[model samples]
Target: KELNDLEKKYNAHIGVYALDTKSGKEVKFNSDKRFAYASTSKAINSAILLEQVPYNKLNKKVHINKDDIVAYSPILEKYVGKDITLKALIEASMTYSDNTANNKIIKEIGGIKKVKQRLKELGDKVTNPVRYDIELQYYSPKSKKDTSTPAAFGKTLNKLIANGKLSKENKKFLLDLMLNNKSGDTLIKDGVPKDYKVADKSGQAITYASRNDVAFVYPKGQSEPIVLVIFTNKDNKSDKPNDKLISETAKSVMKEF
Candidate 1:
């Protein structure tokens, strides 16, 4: 792996794999176990929305009532603008990791209940959605969300890329949507060269003062892409330690695979 100092600097746990999208070569490093998906669950939501609604239908503009949106971060709270369709919200959420856009689309896709059912249909039995906010107080419990194995998630993305499950148009749209993904400087994207087309999603959170990231990396020249997922939770005082772990761990996996 590429990162040795980063790994030693911060105590990090990581899992990685390389999948030949064309010939199905699988490389591994603890990929099946679940880790909190953070905002990465937006991919599942995005898939569900694409399955249920057409891009043309989502183009019919409608104002997001003040109540439909829930603010998660300060950046989301200040995003005031004109009406936009569900398609825009889905794209924006996937592209930019916008929390408000994510919350809106989650509800629009018939809430977490239906989202869970859809995951099962996609051959993901462990994917369960948890509430957005669980515990923030001095004395309370935290909420949890479950997702597919790293291999499963990566394979699922390959399916989308190959147009194996989604219709040709939907496949093209989702591929384009992911190619436009905005979350960067973490995990897969952070470690790889800046130019490779790593169609990815990043998951991160701060709880008990910890940070984590899971992302997919797709190189431009390779026949098959690799999915690099890293989850790091540290009791450290700063998220910097966690970020370092992510960069280092991803670097290690990418270097070898």
Candidate 2:
């Protein structure tokens, strides 16, 4: 199988699954717990805000102040905008993997404490975010603040998309929101073209720990879509090698479809 080949190639543990949520059919590879998910947590944070709070409510422009709106993403330095909207911020968070955008959404959603409380109320067991501020991402592993797992984060999306927990409008909204991920610099988006629609998210870090990408890949038309979640980890020496490996992994997976 393609997965087996990748496992042999990377010499890294792999967990993958392509499912038809409507039909309940699944293709899985180490679907169980394996590694910690990084910025992909931003998707869950974005979802919580979208589902709990109305998109319209989020669009209301209130001054976030320079400090509040200030962020750590390289993109923010050049992007010229008076203020950011919930929609723009969410898109930035999901599409561009913008840390500042993620934190902004967290702030709007009332911080990570509220996100943890909301998830608990939903009867879901998952990790917690130390501080909802994206600028101050839980970078230090020694911080003991980030809480996540690939499966749990994937399920968060599944619950909203497949289950009735999220309304049809919201489900569509979430999928559409994910489509904004224009950062084709990674595997989740690289193998495909600008026109082909792919709803997904990606995570990576300088630490040797991991590089993660999960996506609901939708071609032009199909009754059921394929879901792929890839978690890759390498030494902390540099991200260039891992980025190359991750993109190659994505190229291989695209061939499967």
Candidate 3:
């Protein structure tokens, strides 16, 4: 496969899954391998929070204390003392990949263990995420390890789009946030056509060893979108080539269908 060749050339581990919405046919490569999910795990946490908390409750104001501040989050530092709603925190975390807001969401929804339990109940067996919204490098020994397979993450995304249990409003809310994501758009987004639309989440650890993107692409003339996930774990920290590898791999997959 072209993706396999790309992986070999890039010297990075790769995983992928592409689904044709209309035909329900699919393609996959190294879908079983697990890698650090990094900030992309936020999407799973957000899904669980949306499931457990009512929209009204999420809209209620919450205080942001100094303990909640983190070094890497510029998006949340500006509103430390000001009144902020859970909804705002959720949006910041998802839209801009804000770390502080993500931690707040984790704390707001009980804790990491609680979130993991919820995910297990929802049938996500492979993802064992236990961090407080930081990259893998900062995760402590006490912080449970976070890992995900491309297959599991891809299925979770498909469930988010297709599950009958979730209300249309909730699904639409999450999808909109992903589609309008402002923080990272260099992977799958960079590969597709300008007019094509994608709903996705991207993640990278501090060392830049693990870079990933999972998305549903709205292909032209198709009634349903295609699901695509790419995960790469590299030896070094150069980001540009990793981004290019992901972009080229996704572009090749799109061409195949």
Best by TM-score: 3
Per-candidate TM vs. native?
Answer: 0.77, 0.76, 0.87
> How does each model score on lDDT?
0.58, 0.62, 0.75
- The candidate with the higher TM-score, 2 or 3, is 3
Give the alpha carbon lDDT tens digit for every residue of 1-257 in model 3: 48778978888778787877677777788787767778887777777677766665777888887778886677789887777887888888888888898888888778988877776766888877755756443422233378777778777766655543556676678778989985557888888877788888888777536778877788877747887878777756554336878888888888877
Model 1 per-residue lDDT tens digits across residues 131-221: 6422111111133344345666665555434424555566557657666665555556666776666666666654432344544466667
Model 2, 1-257: lDDT tens per residue? 47677767766556554565556565556666444466777777777777766655667653444465445555443444556667777767776677767777777788778888876766557555665444233344444356454555556566655553555665677777677656535666776544456777777654544677777776556645566666765434343334555556656655556
The TM-score, computed over Cα atoms with residue i paired to residue i, of candidate 3 is 0.87
Q: Candidate 3 has which clashing residue pairs, if any?
A: none
* Candidate 2 segments whose C-alpha is farther than 4 A from its true place: 2-4, 69-71, 74-82, 133-147, 164-170, 190-196, 235-257
State in Å the error of residue 99, model 1: 1.8
RMSD values, in order shown: 4.0, 3.9, 2.9
Clash number for candidate 3? 0
Candidate 3: where are CA atoms >4 Å away?
135-144, 237-241
